[PDB]
Amino acid sequence: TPTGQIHWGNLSKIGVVGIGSASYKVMTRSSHQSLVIKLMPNITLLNNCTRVEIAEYRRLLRTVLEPIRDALNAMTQNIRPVQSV
Amino acid sequence: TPTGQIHWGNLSKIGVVGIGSASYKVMTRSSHQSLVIKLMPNITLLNNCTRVEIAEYRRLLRTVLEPIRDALNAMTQNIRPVQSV
Amino acid sequence: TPTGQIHWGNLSKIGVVGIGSASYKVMTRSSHQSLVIKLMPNITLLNNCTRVEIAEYRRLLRTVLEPIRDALNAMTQNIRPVQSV
Amino acid sequence: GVVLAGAALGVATAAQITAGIALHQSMLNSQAIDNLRASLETTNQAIEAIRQAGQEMILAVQGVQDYINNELIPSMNQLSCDLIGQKLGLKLLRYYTEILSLFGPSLRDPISAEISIQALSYALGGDINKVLEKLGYSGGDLLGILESRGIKARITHVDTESYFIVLSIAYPTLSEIKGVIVHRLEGVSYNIGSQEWYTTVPKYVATQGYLISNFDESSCTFMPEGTVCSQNALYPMSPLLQECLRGSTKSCARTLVSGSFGNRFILSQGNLIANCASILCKCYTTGTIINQDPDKILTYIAADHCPVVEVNGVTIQVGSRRYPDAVYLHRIDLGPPISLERLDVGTNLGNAIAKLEDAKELLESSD
Amino acid sequence: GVVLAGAALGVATAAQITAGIALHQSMLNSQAIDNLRASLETTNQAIEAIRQAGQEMILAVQGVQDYINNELIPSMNQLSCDLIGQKLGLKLLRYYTEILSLFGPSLRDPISAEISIQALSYALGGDINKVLEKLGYSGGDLLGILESRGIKARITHVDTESYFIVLSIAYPTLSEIKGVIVHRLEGVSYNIGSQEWYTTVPKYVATQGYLISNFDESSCTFMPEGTVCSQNALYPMSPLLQECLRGSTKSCARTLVSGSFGNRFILSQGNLIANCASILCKCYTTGTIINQDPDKILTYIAADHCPVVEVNGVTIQVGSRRYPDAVYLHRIDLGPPISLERLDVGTNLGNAIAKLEDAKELLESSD
Amino acid sequence: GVVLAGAALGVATAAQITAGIALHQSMLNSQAIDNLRASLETTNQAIEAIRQAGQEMILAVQGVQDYINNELIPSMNQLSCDLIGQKLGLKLLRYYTEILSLFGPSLRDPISAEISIQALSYALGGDINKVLEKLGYSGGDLLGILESRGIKARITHVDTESYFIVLSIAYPTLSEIKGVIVHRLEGVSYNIGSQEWYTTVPKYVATQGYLISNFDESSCTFMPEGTVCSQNALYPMSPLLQECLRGSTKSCARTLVSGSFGNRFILSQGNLIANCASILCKCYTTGTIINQDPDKILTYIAADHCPVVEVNGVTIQVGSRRYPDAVYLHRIDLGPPISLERLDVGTNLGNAIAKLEDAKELLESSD
Ligand SMILES: *[C@@H]1O[C@H](CO)[C@@H](O[C@@H]2O[C@H](CO)[C@@H](O)[C@H](O)[C@H]2NC(C)=O)[C@H](O)[C@H]1NC(C)=O
Ligand SMILES: *[C@@H]1O[C@H](CO)[C@@H](O[C@@H]2O[C@H](CO)[C@@H](O)[C@H](O)[C@H]2NC(C)=O)[C@H](O)[C@H]1NC(C)=O
Ligand SMILES: *[C@@H]1O[C@H](CO)[C@@H](O[C@@H]2O[C@H](CO)[C@@H](O)[C@H](O)[C@H]2NC(C)=O)[C@H](O)[C@H]1NC(C)=O
Ligand SMILES: *[C@@H]1O[C@H](CO)[C@@H](O)[C@H](O)[C@H]1NC(C)=O
Ligand SMILES: *[C@@H]1O[C@H](CO)[C@@H](O)[C@H](O)[C@H]1NC(C)=O
Ligand SMILES: *[C@@H]1O[C@H](CO)[C@@H](O)[C@H](O)[C@H]1NC(C)=O
């Protein structure tokens, strides 16, 4: 029988019991590691049979990639060394 | 500094600020275009090797399709030309 | 015109109508049938070309399977014949 | 007859107690397992009914065998030995990921879990139709289709020696429950000034003798001859909302059309109920517009006054009157306006309790 | 001109009435179907624009034809006849399962349903980009990408003789709505003692002339030049919460940081608002800590007092003052503390109604 | 040391400020990019650790290379040149669709987004197990499995010249938090007449010194030695509901079994708590039924009165008494009945505020 905050006796009179307790663990992030998603596959052993499909893929990707690239550049242009003050 | 309805000063005293506004655009549908989902594939260059599998597929589809077909026919039988009045 | 509990007239005065009723059917489970998920495939006609991949798969599975096996054994060890009383 | 050792186990829900007893009653015998272990070793199909005379059939499913048999083995004498192993290696990891997702730690209590046949789809090779056909389900009518997809499985054995999972299934059958009618409700907006309101009622409610209940349609699918639910769908309804549905208009709450709203009319009992202040209503038979008395909120259109009405551009012939002529707004008690967004509910409740804690201190002073 | 037979049909929503008329207007003619049936029979592509001069183009999509054409036919003279049929048989069952999921009984009213192009992805062969390209969408800018993904389809014909489904699509275009500004709100915590509170407001609200409304961002995506929504996003807001946003601090509710909380400061109008009781604030220019008056709840940091501030370890140069110096807590009327978990709301409401039903019986005694 | 230009940027959340600084600190140097660009150009694997002595390893992942290497290249001298390009063309569009889904406009602020490793599954080739193994995760125990799946990524560079995305990952480790116990709560029904009620409490609550808190289990998985959460799970609880859990039975709300209900008994502390008015309870040792006093609502069954009890057909041996004999209902203060459906809450709240706005006008008249 554990005890504490929660009043097991009076709760049991209205049909409530505790059926398990556990400690509480949260996740912390530390360190770093770089992962690069290489969007252009190596196709040389396919001897240009996929040129049209690759070019269209590359064109579709630009529409998605350019706005993110712009946002990243927009931020770091506001990140200066200390002594500009 | 934008102003209007929302009272930015008094909200800032209780920790609330606005971090962005935008206009509001909703989508409207117009015109028409027909799209047909062709459920039976062209299999002739497979020379009857798939007859059993195709027949079973076609049989499974009927159970799903027939109730919709009936509902569509039920509705248009209540859609008459004006002059029946 | 159906009638009963719900007062269709007075609701219609504030814009509410009933647009369909149905009976209520719930599912009951009975009987039994055993289904076994065979986790190790038959690979003999592949003549040991997949030994490394199979061994790693089998190793990954143990981590998932062992805790369930333990839980099942923990329960049935508390399930005794009547006469132990 | 068996007994559960309750002092040893100490704590358990009814669901866990009942699954444990069922586990004892449904698990394969110690020697059925060695036989099953040996039958599995020698088979080579994706799906296979394992028939041992005396014992019942056991359905064995191998999640990557079709891929091996159809894609890898016919390639045995055209591809290198690494490549065959690499091809399968990708499939095995994708299969492991699904086993991890379903039987791993996110499965809260595996002993008492009931796993739907659909959740097993990937573990069984990406599709369940041949598995169901072997169990006797044809796919020939939609009720049988619904029943089959209500099959649930419990785990009865996990073998770490030969790597297989024995599950026990049960067959659903349909139980029509006696008194209970499900009703679908639908509102149209009405005008006070240029403001469009509608009364807030649930999408589905259920009647059950004298009681009106709430109805959770999440686990139901609406066949033409009844609502089929995989779960309990019935839940209590407050006395206040029940009174609303029993004719007390003052008890029903209401909220604005703050946005766009596509329900300014409805066809009901062969009549049109329409907010003819918010859309153009017109009698097609006579060519004359139908204006809504500005001290009325709705128009009830029937063939006593207009056999064929045009309504927001749609032309509808209507039948004889089944709803009385609209009354003046002053003869209708409207209920409270409310907002349903959950943070508004909390903000207004928080205010109400504070005023109510206030109110007990003046009612000490005056008494 | 056509008329709906309202007495026969008896009951129908505006959505069902309007889709039915649209069904009559958009369905292919009886002889366009026999022509379509014959054109489908002779084609062999996954996607194909069926052009019959006079009639408009009809886009035909076959969900397993790419698999047959790319994977099975080149194998015709290397694999056995069973194996080809088994390979396709697996694909056909996986395709049937998706048709069952989309057009089967879980589709509540197929006649008035509007099916998003994305929901059709599997029925159309697992991808929609070539289908959209044939319809004129290039993928060249993100607005055109968003508009294309707002396409919805209605069912206009189901053929049980040749097994095909005719759908009618409409093209979305963008409607900027005149007066409506969407505003994103963000709070920082403040301290009363060692207790960290923050005021509870919605993540998005909308202003619309004099009105403030709630805003459901579920169906919206936030482009740089406007919020694009596939659904009505506007909904009513209670007068009480509107008063909160209009400057009545006593009307805004508040709740605890019971857990971890990452909003103890924010950059706004070139200033820093910071709970400098809960984190270290420091002037980098002068090297001197910034303490928060213990009878104040926030600090408003500007270049009149600190051109470059260090805040929880992050160094920020700030601009000239745009927010007044913090006032004493006693000059700020705080609103009610509340909890938003739904079961707490119900428990406190249930108590409040009971006390309020009590209160009417003492107010009979004293009057 | 770097400084953020706060006047230029004008407005930013703490999350955006902190990710921006982290972006500056974690992005690859301008010449590490040209080196990375060249290393990517010459590689041909699906997954590859790019080791340049001096700099740290960079893990490069190519989402369709396994398909090219395993399926297309061995077919180079058996299939036509169109067919190879068509086969790959289908794969590239399916891959583009996933990039669009993850990095496209539905990604609200890409700069400060933290993308789970699982959300990257398709972008990384359909599976993450080999990626994790290269990072040092074995899959050998379930805690390490949970930690690995808590990895989140931030975007640090998008290259439009060579089409690649650099992400920065961090490694999760477990932080047991000192005072906090998570408790799982479970109710059984009780009878007033033939009506079955149960008291409404949350499924999980947390104790934290003197405080009781709500607990959102959405982001948690319940290992045998602790609850592991990827998110803050703790949230405030109203004083009223805390009083309920502290023994004030009048403070706990209650609701009906309107439907089917499988919790009429529970095993707890080696005893059975059972609604023996709603199911058959029987002493197996003596053979005698256990009737529930009709002015009692539950039965507390222990070995002082029945060593082995049969309960709804299940036979359980119980231990010595750990719960007192049931008391009469009149010695138990029950709290308010409520309904939890959100529209009932709004309807009853809307009524309560209206009565409460009424109440202030009579309390002007009598004062
Ligand atoms: C249907 O309509 C009205 C509600 O608007 C009901 O008439 C009310 O009856 C109560 C007593 O039951 C009277 O005190 C009110 O004065 C009436 N209201 C008005 C505006 O006159 C009528 O009884 C309702 N029917 C039902 C079953 O509730
Ligand atoms: C902004 O701040 C305060 C609220 O704290 C408002 O001043 C109050 O005004 C009301 C009447 O409108 C007075 O009864 C109160 O005495 C004032 N409160 C205090 C603490 O002095 C001020 O008007 C608010 N601005 C707006 C637009 O609401
Ligand atoms: C457990 O049970 C009862 C609640 O039913 C509590 O006894 C009540 O105590 C209050 C004062 O604290 C009295 O005014 C009531 O008269 C009592 N109720 C009844 C029905 O007699 C008891 O104190 C509870 N224990 C705790 C910690 O709250
Ligand atoms: C796999 O297949 C063959 C043929 O069915 C079977 O006889 C053999 O026993 C199985 N392989 C193994 C290792 O059991
Ligand atoms: C399938 O393909 C061929 C070639 O396109 C076509 O001519 C034929 O009519 C189609 N097969 C059938 C059964 O219609
Ligand atoms: C692709 O693969 C080959 C072999 O690994 C490599 O040397 C070559 O540089 C790569 N192709 C291209 C275009 O870089």
Residue D202: inside a domain, yes or no? yes
Interatomic CA distance for residues A81 and E12, integer angstroms: 68
Burial of residue F108, with CB atoms counted within 10 A of its CB: 0-12 exposed, 13-18 middle, 19 or more buried:
exposed
Same domain, D143 and D223: no
Strands (E), E252-341: 254-256, 265-268, 271-274, 281-283, 289-290, 299-301, 308-311, 314-317
Pull the structure tokens for residue A7. Answer: 């009043």
| Cβ of C33 less than 6 Å from ligand 4 | no
Question: How many Å lie between the alpha carbon of F109 and the closest alpha carbon of chain D?
Answer: 24
C-alpha D274 to ligand 1 mean position (Å): 23
* Closest ligand 2 atom to E248 CA: 28
| In the block, residue with structure tokens 């009886």 | E30
The beta-carbon neighbor of C85 closest among F129, F145, F307 is F307
Contact D317, E2 (CB under 8 A): no
Other Cβ atoms closer than 10 A to E180? 22
Q: Are strands F220-223 and F254-256 parallel, antiparallel or unpaired?
A: unpaired
Burial of residue F66, with CB atoms counted within 10 A of its CB: 0-12 exposed, 13-18 middle, 19 or more buried:
buried
The beta-carbon neighbor of E21 closest among D129, D314, D354 is D314
Which residues are paired to D255 by β-bridges?
A: D198
Same domain, D208 and D296: yes
Same domain, D208 and D324: yes
Per CB-CB distance under 8 Å, the chain D contacts of E83 are 70, 74
> Phi-psi category of E129—alpha, beta or left, where left has phi over 0 and alpha has psi -120 to 50?
alpha
Q: Which of A64, A78, A85 has the highest number of chain E CBs within 10 A, making it the mutation to test binding with E?
A: A85
| Cβ of B44 less than 6 Å from ligand 5 | yes
Give the HSE-up count for residue D15: Cα atoms under 13 Å, Cβ half-sphere. 14
Contact B52, E138 (CB under 8 A): no
A vs B contact (3+ beta-carbon pairs below 8 A): no
Report CA F94 to chain centroid distance, whole Å: 30
Q: Does F5 touch chain B (CB under 8 A)?
A: no
Q: Does F86 touch chain E (CB under 8 A)?
A: yes
E strand or H helix at B34, and its extent? strand B16-38
| In the block, residue with structure tokens 């199979």 | C54
Written in H, E and C, the secondary structure of chain D is: CEEEEHHHHCCEEHHHHHHHHHHHHHCCCHHHHHHHHHHHHCCCCCEEEECCCCCCCEEEECCCHHHHHHHHHHHCCCCCHHHHHHHHHHHHHHHHHHHHHHHCCCCCCCCCCCEECCCCCCCCCCCCHHHHHHCCCCCCCHHHHHHHCCCEEEEEEEECCCCEEEEEEEEEEEEEEEEEEEEEEEECCEEECCEEEEECCCCEEEEECCEEEEECHHHEEEECCEEEECCCCEECCCHHHHHHHCCCHHHCCEEECCCCCCCCEEEECCEEEECCCCCCEEECCCCCEECCCCCCCCEEECCCCCCEEEECCEEEECCCCCCCCCCCHHHCCCCCECCCCHHHHHHHHHHHHHHHHHHHHHHHHCC
The residue contributing the CA closest to ligand 3 atom 26 is: F247
Residue E320 one-letter amino acid: S
How many domains does chain D fold into? Answer: 2
Same domain, D147 and D185: no
**Experimental resolution (Å):** 2.8
Per CB-CB distance under 8 Å, the chain E contacts of D66 are 86, 90
Report CA F179 to chain centroid distance, whole Å: 21
Question: How many Å lie between the alpha carbon of E348 and the closest alpha carbon of chain B?
Answer: 25
Interatomic CA distance for residues D307 and D301, integer angstroms: 9
Interatomic CA distance for residues E80 and F104, integer angstroms: 45
Contact A60, F96 (CB under 8 A): yes
Same domain, D98 and D18: yes
User: Which residue segment(s) compose the domain that D93 sits in?
Assistant: 6-170
For residue F321, give the DSSP letter. Answer: -
E strand or H helix at F182, and its extent? strand F164-187
Surface of F (214-233) touching D: CB under 8 A: 221-223
The residue contributing the CA closest to ligand 6 atom 2 is: F44
The residue contributing the CA closest to ligand 3 atom 9 is: F248
**Nearest ligand, measured from the Cα of E48:** 5
C-alpha D44 to ligand 4 mean position (Å): 6
Are F352 and E351 inside 8 Å of each other by CB?
A: no
| In the block, residue with structure tokens 């032309």 | D315
User: CA distances (Å), A79 to each of F19, F111, F270, in order?
Assistant: 12, 14, 63
Interatomic CA distance for residues E279 and E272, integer angstroms: 13
Interatomic CA distance for residues D185 and C16, integer angstroms: 7
Q: Does D195 touch chain F (CB under 8 A)?
A: no
Counts of helices then strands in chain C (DSSP H, E): 2, 2
Are E2 and D269 inside 8 Å of each other by CB?
A: no
Greatest alpha-carbon pair distance for chain C in Å reads 78
Residue E192: inside a domain, yes or no? no
Interatomic CA distance for residues F133 and F139, integer angstroms: 8
Provide CB contacts within 8 A for C24, sequence distance 6+.
D176, D177, D180, D181, D182, D206, D226, D227, D229, D233, D234
Residue E15: inside a domain, yes or no? yes
Residue E225: inside a domain, yes or no? no
E vs F contact (3+ beta-carbon pairs below 8 A): yes
Interatomic CA distance for residues D4 and C85, integer angstroms: 11
Q: Are strands E164-187 and B16-38 parallel, antiparallel or unpaired?
A: antiparallel
Contact A15, F265 (CB under 8 A): no
* Closest ligand 2 atom to B7 CA: 27
Same domain, D108 and D205: no
C-alpha F332 to ligand 3 mean position (Å): 9
The candidate with the shortest Cα–Cα distance to C41, out of D128, D162, D166, is: D162
Give the HSE-up count for residue B73: Cα atoms under 13 Å, Cβ half-sphere. 10
The candidate with the shortest Cα–Cα distance to E60, out of B39, B65, F89, is: B39
Same domain, D165 and D202: no
Are B63 and D139 inside 8 Å of each other by CB?
A: yes
> Phi-psi category of A51—alpha, beta or left, where left has phi over 0 and alpha has psi -120 to 50?
alpha
Residue D365: inside a domain, yes or no? no
Pull the structure tokens for residue E139. Answer: 């993928």
Are A38 and F222 inside 8 Å of each other by CB?
A: no
Pull the structure tokens for residue F241. Answer: 């509901």
Contact A24, F235 (CB under 8 A): no
Question: How many Å lie between the alpha carbon of B33 and the closest alpha carbon of chain D?
Answer: 22
Pull the structure tokens for residue A9. Answer: 């006796």
Angle subtended by helix axes F342-365 and D342-365, to nearest 10: 30
Pull the structure tokens for residue D60. Answer: 């064995």
Contact D254, D197 (CB under 8 A): yes
Same domain, D149 and D49: yes
C-alpha D333 to ligand 1 mean position (Å): 8
Report CA D235 to chain centroid distance, whole Å: 14
Interatomic CA distance for residues E200 and B14, integer angstroms: 10
DSSP per-residue string spanning chain A:
---SSS-HHHHHTTTEEEEEEEEEEEEEEEEEEEEEEE-S---GGGTTTTHHHHHHHHHHHHHHHHHHHHHHHHHHTTEEEGGG-
Q: Which of C12, C17, C19 has the highest number of chain E CBs within 10 A, making it the mutation to test binding with E?
A: C19
Per-residue b or e along F240-266, where b marks 16 or more CB atoms closer than 10 Å to that residue's CB: bbbbbbeebbebbbbbbbbbebebbbb
Phi and psi at E172, nearest 5°, equal -75, 140
Per CB-CB distance under 8 Å, the chain C contacts of D184 are 18-21
Phi and psi at F58, nearest 5°, equal -120, 125
Residue E317: inside a domain, yes or no? no
The beta-carbon neighbor of B79 closest among E4, E155, E163 is E4
Interatomic CA distance for residues E247 and E211, integer angstroms: 14
Q: Which of C63, C75, C78, C83 has the highest number of chain F CBs within 10 A, making it the mutation to test binding with F?
A: C63
The beta-carbon neighbor of D142 closest among B59, B67, B85 is B67
Question: How many Å lie between the alpha carbon of A60 and the closest alpha carbon of chain F?
Answer: 7
Q: Name the domain boundary from D170, D198, D221.
A: D170
Question: C-alpha angle E124/E126/E132, rounded to 5°?
Answer: 60
Are F350 and D336 inside 8 Å of each other by CB?
A: yes
For residue F126, give the DSSP letter. Answer: S
CATH number, domain at D219? 2.40.490.10
For residue B39, give the DSSP letter. Answer: -
The candidate with the shortest Cα–Cα distance to C30, out of D169, E305, E208, F289, is: D169
DSSP per-residue string spanning E208-270:
ETTEEEEE-GGGEEEETTEEEESS--EE---HHHHHHHTT-GGGS-EEE--S----SEEEETT
Question: How many Å lie between the alpha carbon of E140 and the closest alpha carbon of chain D?
Answer: 31
Residue spans of alpha helices (H) in chain F: 6-9, 14-26, 30-41, 65-67, 81-103, 129-134, 142-148, 239-245, 342-365
Residue E100: inside a domain, yes or no? yes
Contact D221, D146 (CB under 8 A): yes
Residue E115 one-letter amino acid: I
* Closest ligand 2 atom to E332 CA: 5
Sign of CA dihedral D100, D104, D108, D113: positive
Interatomic CA distance for residues F65 and F40, integer angstroms: 13
E-chain residue closest to D240, CA distance: E353
Contact D134, E97 (CB under 8 A): no
Residue E236: inside a domain, yes or no? no
User: CA distances (Å), E143 to each of D181, D228, E233, E350, in order?
Assistant: 47, 42, 19, 48
Sign of CA dihedral E29, E35, E37, E39: negative
Interatomic CA distance for residues F226 and F233, integer angstroms: 14
DSSP per-residue string spanning F58-81:
EEEE-TTHHHIIIIIGGGTTTS-H
The candidate with the shortest Cα–Cα distance to D178, out of D237, D243, D234, D230, is: D234
Contact A15, F38 (CB under 8 A): no
C-alpha C60 to ligand 4 mean position (Å): 23
Q: Does D38 touch chain C (CB under 8 A)?
A: no
Interatomic CA distance for residues F110 and E23, integer angstroms: 42
Residue C18 one-letter amino acid: G
Question: How many Å lie between the alpha carbon of D87 and the closest alpha carbon of chain F?
Answer: 7
Contact F158, A6 (CB under 8 A): no
Experimental method: X-ray
Interatomic CA distance for residues D269 and B4, integer angstroms: 48
Residue D24 one-letter amino acid: H
Interatomic CA distance for residues E135 and E56, integer angstroms: 13
Interatomic CA distance for residues F290 and F308, integer angstroms: 12
C-alpha D166 to ligand 2 mean position (Å): 69
Is residue F212 helix, strand or coil? strand
Per CB-CB distance under 8 Å, the chain C contacts of F307 are 85
DSSP per-residue string spanning E40-89:
HHT---SEEEE--TTSPPEEEE-TTHHHIIIIIGGGTTTS-HHHHHHHHH
